[PDB]
Amino acid sequence: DILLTQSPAILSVSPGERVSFSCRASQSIGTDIHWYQQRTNGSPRLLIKYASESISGIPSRFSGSGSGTDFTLSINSVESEDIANYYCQQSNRWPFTFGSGTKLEI
């Protein structure tokens, strides 16, 4: 069972700054990494798939990068609406798994 680690668990940033969340897999997963956003009392929302691919409807300030075991989800110009929990999930090997999650904080 792949283990995705998201540290730090909490992230503090100033309005407008560039922020980055880390996800690291216990083994090489290529690019099979996907990000989700979850605000207070909401359901998860796909933000990035296959480490860097964009989704229709997601603000152009969201990007992703990485391969193997190190992945990064970035946000250029952190706003209000970004306050939320971020999770990463892999599809490389069965069963799919989820990161511990990271809370954004302005």
Partner 1 sequence: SALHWRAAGAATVLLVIVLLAGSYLAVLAERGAPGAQLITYPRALWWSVETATTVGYGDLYPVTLWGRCVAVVVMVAGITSFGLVTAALATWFVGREQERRGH
Q: Which residues bind ligand DGA (CB under 6 A)?
A: 31, 50
Please say which residue, 66 or 99, places its beta carbon nearer to a copy of itself. Answer: 66
Please say which residue, 38 or 91, places its beta carbon nearer to ligand DGA. Answer: 91
DSSP secondary structure code for residue 35 in this structure = E
Q: How far is the CB of 69 from a copy of itself (least distance, A)?
A: 9
Please say which residue, 54 or 91, places its beta carbon nearer to partner 1. Answer: 91
Candidate segments 6-14, 18-26, 76-84, 93-101, binder of partner 1 by CB under 8 A = 93-101
Q: Is 59 left (phi over 0), alpha (psi -120 to 50) or beta?
A: beta
Regarding 81 and contact with partner 1 (CB under 8 A), the answer is no
Look at the block and give the residue holding tokens 């969201």. 62
Amino acid letter for position 74: S
- For residue 58, give both structure tokens: 């997601």
Q: How far is CA 6 from CA 57, 59, 73, in A?
A: 25, 22, 11
**Residue ranges binding partner 1 (CB under 8 A):** 1, 30-31, 51-52, 65-68, 91-95
